[PDB]
Subunit: 261 residues, 7 copies
């Protein structure tokens, strides 16, 4: 009956039992605290129960393997398996965490605001709100699109309404017989008569190219962002009316045919 | 016959034997408990047996290498191999775990509900149900599509029926000789006569562009989500009837030919 | 001639020799057991021999480095190299393991069954069987396609025959001079005369759009899944016969030509 | 002159020298054994020499750092660097190892055999042989394609000759004036006169659609895999001859023109 | 009542209590310091509070597990879980960190400057500013685009205004009957009359190809970057005027028709 | 003045100083040896100096942290940082190492040889040489393409000249009025008159399809690889001459027009 | 008042204080040295200050946790967090490091030189210089493109000017009535009259195909790299002149029309 080694072993076993008992009570208390906190705010019953069960299982596994290590059982392989499981969970949650970080960045740097008409990688609409994981926008068609923030941060973010002034472009295709200077002066008169077109900005009216069936002119004018569509429609209808009155004819697809027999 | 070192070795070997025996009985008991639990609920026989065999093999490997470590055999390489295998399994299960996390997020944030007509990255249909891993939707054609939740969370989620009001768009192509104001007033009268078109929303009737063979007008009106298709059909048929009665002719593809010889 | 340290060294060397000898016999016995088990069931000779050789090499390396560690040679670098090799093997087997997990999920959740006509990401066919790694389907052409389960789980799974009722769609292009109400009533009579078209489902017969050379009507009717193709063919032939009898003419590509000189 | 600590240090230095000397002789002997084994079979001189040099360098590094650790120099950073290098090599060899695993799977499950005409993700040809890393197929053009097995396992594997019976499809475009029943009965007579067309399989002869310039019929018949092309050619030529004899005319692209001025 | 082991245990427990108390006060002090520093500069209240809470939780977890380790509870599994969480966070923040590094590189090497018209992988505009994470450019249309720096560093960066001289290219399509030397000399005279075209640079005027309906000439001239568009427009209008005066006719799409019956 | 612990500390400090001094001299000697070896063969001065500096810095860091560990400073965090840096370097060099492994595989298995006309994923040319990292080929146009070996190993490798015999295919489009048997016999006579066409291989001359404006025949013949282009040209010119002599007319795009008004 | 354990604790605390003080002075001295070195060469003030701050923070964290470990506080979790941060930084810098390695390889193997006209994955231009991270090329248009070296190493590198001789190809489309031998002899005479066309290289003049409206000949000739464009232009203009003189007519798009009513 040794008094040193046996007492050391008794200390080890009592310490292991204390460790496991304290771990059990700690897991129970933290489970109760988490349940109370989740009750204190909005939460789903099923998801909250799953979360509490998962954290309880984790803590009881921790204390069980700690007691095993104190007893003398090597738990290095169990630690390796737990690390592998944690890495698997991290890889699984990589996407959601990346979306969360992207949402944080979007909140911080404010590339776009609520109620701001923007285009995000092929989808354009007025932003309603930005959440932690994904934004919500309403298209001009009236559809609702929910875009995760990670793919928003990736790629360009076109902000339409950041600049108060935007430029219109008109492609006018008239017949080759039309008088170049006459067309240019008619277009210039139309541009001058318009009050919503900025006068200090460049007003480009030039012959752009020679198409297959027509000669294409380019008309580039700037206007306020909130009036661009109306300016475009007004200038287009005015151009059509003026060309019809002045005899300028928009040509149909031309063709040159040669007869055989 | 030493009394300290030999007794220490005897303690080590007896402890190793106790560890392996306890590990075997623990593996057997946990296997029985898992089998009973899987019997208590719905499970496949083959899959349940494979799962029980895998967990049994894992636990017996744990206790065997623990006994080896207690005896004195270094098991660091075995731990390295087991960690590599765990990492391989984690990488393999990354996709399924990501789908599970995405499904949890879809349940939580509720981007779309059951019975809600939505479009998910090129496929549109009415959602039937959302499971842990994948959703199910029925297309308007009547087909069933099962979409994993990970690729739903990735990319945009178009929700058609979230907004009660959606906008229609009509592209009317009439001949260049038609009277612009007459066409506009006919379209406006048609829009006014329609009761299902919202009057407080913007009712756009403008000349949109000058096409190759026709002048294109744009007609944009809003209506309730549940009547959009009928409104479109009614307005289209009414437009055709009114243009036929009023003499406005939709032009066939025009061509200008010039003869040689 | 010391009696403590030298005896400790003798214990160490004898223990190392015992460890390596036991490792060799254990490797031989497990190799024999694996060979016997592989003989007891279906296996390839070359692949089984390679597997047995690989596991034998692994076990002998384990016991050799364990003996080195017991002797006193540090094997941490060898453990690092073995861990790197295990990680490389895990990355290599990631694809096959992912396919296995996907196959397990396909068995469990049963998105599609054997003999069920489905479309899987661009390939459509009747499923023959689902294996652990890949499925087999026969296309309507008669071809055999083997699809790994991972890419099945990734992306949508269109199930054609899950819903007993599917909807047909007919696009009828008639000349602009045709009477809208006459065409609609002829189509409605044809739909009513058909017994295989469900009457309780919506039977849509509306003017869909105004094409370049014709006005397009939309005919949407539902029918049983096993009769959809025959219903389509019958309705199409009936429509052609009725339009030919009633004088409704399907227009050829129209063109409007204007002569110069 | 202490007798315990100094003797311990002498033991340490002698053990380190023994370790390094034994490591050198072991590296030399294993290098000789590897060289002899590579001589005993087919190998490249340059590649074999590089492999032997690499393994020799690895073993000498192992024994050198082991001697350093025995002396008392901590080699944890060296172990970290070696682990990083091993991980880099594993990532580099991931592709080749994945190809090897894919080849093993292809050998095991036998999705396709030698001399079997298959299509593998856009390339179709008769398989010549399957190696450890890549297969070889000959296209019908006579070209040789070497396909790595990893990208074969990824994606679908279309096996043309697995099913002894395949289905042909004929798209016949005849003028709108042609008699539907007459065309159907002529096609049916042609199908019946053919002996290589399976009679127990479905023989589909229906009006498929109404094209822009013609009405398209669908003819679907099954035949043996080794006669499909000849059956197609024979049926096509027979159809042309019968339609020419019976007056059925395949229409050229139709056009409806309207004159102005 | 032992005096060595019990005193050692008392030292351990007192040291653990000291460690946890010092950890708590250190966490509180560093939280106060971080809050003060964030108050001293621009910061969001919510984000700053979340950051302080996260760092406080991290530090208290560190000191709690340190106290557990001092007491004697093994915390290796907790360390494994914390390492997995850290790896998950690192993978999540990989994108933002890559953008930060790319922005640093863009600042250092200066591929483009503010106010410099450039094209970045499909989007072209004048750069306004470069931030830590993303740049801002204004397109010629007037739109604002925010581009993350990582995708700028990836792929090419076209710098339009780095070179003071750029080359124009004119594609002139004239009828086959036109005189080649006459067209060449007219184009050369037009090029010579232009003062904004560099004379020391190559002035290419050659017959480029034989098109379907015309023979295409290539005109390549260099000019200053700030005058390229005006030079193009002037040369184009001058070419049209000179060809109209000289009788050179730009041909409409030719066609050769042959009559049957 | 203790004689045990103080002497132990003196041993520790002297051992640390010896370790650092030996590390410095070893780093210097290995740097000199590496510089001499790089001088003995072809090397760049800048790259060699950078490599020597990097290895010197690595070795001095190793010995410095080893001396710190011997003194008693824990260097685990430094080891963690060094491991992270090594992993970063491994990820950076992954691409180059993968190219090296792919080049080794290409040398070993010999999918293609020097001077062998092959196509490698969209680029076709005659291979000049294969290096450790990338190959070089000359296209038929005369251009030089350098292809990294990794993307060669990935994807298919089309070897044109591996098979001595390749098959030609001729698509002949003749008018619908032409006599099928007459065309077939003319083509067969042309095929028979050709001596470079293999007679034992299948010589396919069949009516392939019914095109929009012509009936398409398929002519498939085999020939030696070194004469395929000349055989194609000769057969094509012979076919044109024979059809022109025999009255068979290749039809221009047909059109059927119907007049209105 | 014990004299062994208390003196050991005093040694530990004094050693910890010495470690932290030495760490602080070492961090300060290395910060001063780094600042001096960065002053001695070109550097940005902001970036240099950030780098010095980062390295100072790293070193002070190292020494602080070392002092904690010496005192007795376990810092394993802190080491885990630092390792996670290092891995995150490594993943972030992976792209830049890969670009650096690719640039080193480009310098070493010299796939292309400065002033060498090459095409790099869709962009072609004359290379100006190659830096550590990215190259710079000027397109023939005069634009400047900066290409990171990683995407240069990935994918093919087309080197236009490596081969002194390149081959031209001319596609000549003449009417079906033209005499084949006459066209061939005219083309051959044109090829012979050209002195810049290599005579020892193959001069291919054959009928290539039968197009919809013309018969296409292929003309393939080789020339020096620095004269290819001029040779092409000269041969093209000569061909047009000779065909116009000899009566050979390049046909316009043919059409065969058939009249109804």
């Amino acid at each position: 009956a040794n008094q040193a080694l046996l007492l050391s072993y008794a200390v080890n076993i009592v310490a292991a039992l204390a460790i496991i008992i304290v771990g059990l009570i700690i897991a129970r208390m933290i489970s109760n605290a988490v349940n109370r906190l989740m009750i204190s705010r909005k939460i789903d019953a099923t998801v909250a129960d799953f979360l509490s069960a998962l954290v309880r299982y984790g803590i009881i596994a921790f204390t069980l393997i700690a007691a095993l290590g104190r007893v003398g059982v090597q738990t290095a392989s169990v630690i390796a398996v737990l690390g592998a499981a944690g890495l698997a969970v991290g890889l699984a949650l990589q996407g959601s965490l990346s979306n969360l970080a992207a949402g944080v960045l979007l909140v911080m740097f404010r590339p776009f605001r609520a109620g701001e008409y923007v285009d995000l990688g092929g989808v354009a609409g007025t932003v309603l709100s930005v959440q932690i994981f994904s934004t919500t926008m309403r298209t001009a068609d009236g559809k609702i699109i929910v875009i995760p923030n990670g793919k928003i941060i990736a790629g360009n973010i076109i902000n339409f309404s950041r600049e108060p002034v935007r430029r219109n472009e008109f492609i006018i295709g008239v017949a080759y017989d039309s008088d170049i200077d006459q067309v240019k002066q008619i277009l210039t008169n139309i541009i001058q008569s318009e009050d919503r077109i900025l006068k200090d900005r460049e007003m480009t009216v030039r012959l752009n190219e020679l198409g297959a069936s027509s000669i294409n002119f380019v008309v580039r004018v700037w206007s306020n962002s909130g009036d661009l569509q109306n300016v475009y429609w007004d200038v287009l209808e005015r151009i059509k009316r003026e060309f019809d009155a002045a005899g300028i004819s928009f040509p149909y697809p031309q063709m040159d045919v040669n007869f055989k027999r």
